[PDB]
From TrEMBL, chain A:
Name under which the protein is recorded: Enoyl-CoA hydratase
GO biological process annotation, one example: fatty acid metabolic process
GO MF term list: enoyl-CoA hydratase activity
PROSITE patterns: ENOYL_COA_HYDRATASE
Family: Belongs to the enoyl-CoA hydratase/isomerase family.
Automatic annotation (TrEMBL), chain C:
NCBIfam families according to UniProt: PRK08259.1
Lineage summary: Bacteria, Bacillati, Actinomycetota, Actinomycetes, Mycobacteriales
Name of the featured protein: Enoyl-CoA hydratase
Keywords: Fatty acid metabolism, Lipid metabolism
Pfam families the UniProt entry points to: ECH_1
Provenance organism: Mycolicibacterium smegmatis (strain ATCC 700084 / mc(2)155) (Mycobacterium smegmatis)
InterPro entries: ClpP/crotonase-like_dom_sf, Enoyl-CoA_hyd/isom_CS, Enoyl-CoA_hydra/iso
Length: 225, 230, 226
């Protein structure tokens, strides 16, 4: 048998699927896993034949968060002010979009990976929630769904089911159990068929405007050409 | 019809895009007329609230693609009016969009520039310029995330998908949904309600709610407090 | 006009002016500011609940007190007109709304981290009708809380929002049966007080601090939690 890969990459034309695959650890992200995720997305960003990525977990779950059991071992999550975030790709500003395909649980650092993605496609039976946040949760959640609901989720740490996630704008799509990956890959293929430069420029302006005045944001938008 | 018509009823001014063959697409002259209409509104102390709407059962299909490369083409410059006309203006008084049929691409951007959106039950909104490969350069990428949050904004912006009135209302994009053919009337009723309120105070509150975007809590609170001077 | 009740690590701050329907005048605002100063500084208090007695929350600033010694204090420095509305507390506050939370009263509810609302409660910018400006953070906080579109609706029109609509738009975080807002908020406060405190508080402060900041600067600040 071959050695275990905690992150598998599959490509189908211009769509790259990045898969967390740690059955025993319920897709928890340790140091080597985070490094592999960061490398997978670095490779995606630089590859001009890849248009859209999908981030998913195997084994019927997305990601249980940072690998607690690895704390104090050589496999521990790397926590530094510089370089990659503890979960891996969570500080990256990619030039192209990523869709999260969520089955089972997307919790703690796992939720943060989902917030980092552009869109979230969620199974009807999936659960999201906070359950410190140092992979962008406190930054992204209020921007994504508004301060009021963000502060609810952040303070309480409560579970959010798919119906509520959809109602509040956290889940962009809700699909039947087991279908998140397929549905996200199709949506990624649909996006890959659109005029790319224009879509990518519009995405980057919608990201860049956060924290800017109307005047400055409009200026940056106009550079789309 | 001239491409933009202006009708007034006391302190409510209705600005009407009226280009039947072009489905109310906005070309260069049309954009210039919209900019002038709103300049005149902003400066007129007898006008309190404006309504932006489209004739012919639709709102605005976006920038006039067919006019590209002609004398009537949209004017695209870093300075001055935006391509769609009024899309860069910071008016001192509010504007209500009254949407029938389509408000798509640059037409959606005009609707996002308005303070409020009143939408017919059958109306359709969306970033249809996604499919044509024309960029959002009249504020859509700036205003949509602020209006309805980053998550839903990025959905609409990336996919370019159609949003019907029920979904627009559910996500906060449509502020009111009314029966087909009633958007203009309902917007004009709402505009008249707003015109009856104490004006200075409402206008100061509106300007602070706009200005706070991109500011820290402290700086935004400071700006807000200056409303006491108004 | 302000009563403070404590139950372990949960402090309840109560506006209590029956004749004035819990309107906040100068002395009341000063008492609210002091209550929250004391809460912030008290290491044995984890979570606060802000609520009103007499079946209502707060009708706003006390208009009838204008021009009297009891008038709201309106200054660019120091406490806001409503009292605690400019404070950046180190710990969370839950609003427990019965009856009306309108005008400055709505602004106090927006200043809180969460809002628990009775099924028959009413919220709105009723100062629109009176011509009194929002100067206790409403224009700042409402668009952040629920998005610009719905904020501008409520701000321009001054219309009433019932509990169901408040819940649908993300203004009310919980809706409970009439008469239960205070109890439900105190339960929720106790739940929060049982969680690991340093972590919850740091996450809260980062989610507040990021407003107005670029992604990069906000991420930098967040990382200082660890
Ligand atoms: Na800023």
């Amino acid at each position: 048998s071959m050695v275990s890969e905690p992150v598998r990459i599959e490509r189908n034309g211009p769509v790259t699927t990045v898969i967390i695959d740690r059955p025993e650890a319920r897709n928890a992200v340790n140091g080597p896993t985070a490094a592999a995720l960061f490398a997978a997305f670095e490779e995606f960003d630089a590859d001009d034949t890849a248009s859209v990525a999908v981030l998913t977990g195997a084994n019927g779950t997305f990601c249980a968060g940072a690998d607690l059991k690895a704390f104090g071992t050589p496999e521990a999550n790397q926590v530094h002010r510089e370089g990659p975030g503890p979960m891996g790709p969570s500080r990256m500003d990619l030039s192209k979009p990523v869709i999260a395909a969520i089955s089972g649980y997307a919790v703690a650092g796992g939720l943060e990976l989902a917030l980092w993605c552009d869109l979230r496609v969620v199974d009807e039976d999936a659960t999201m929630g906070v359950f410190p946040l140092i992979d962008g949760g406190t930054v992204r959640l209020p921007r994504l769904i508004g301060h009021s609901r963000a502060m609810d989720l952040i303070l309480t740490g409560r579970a959010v089911d798919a119906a509520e996630a959809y109602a509040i704008g956290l889940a962009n799509r809700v699909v039947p159990t087991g279908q998140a990956r397929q549905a996200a890959e199709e949506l990624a293929a649909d996006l890959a068929r659109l005029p790319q430069q224009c879509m990518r420029a519009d995405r980057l302006s919608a990201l860049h405007q956060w924290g800017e005045s109307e005047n400055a944001a409009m200026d940056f938008e106009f550079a789309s050409i």
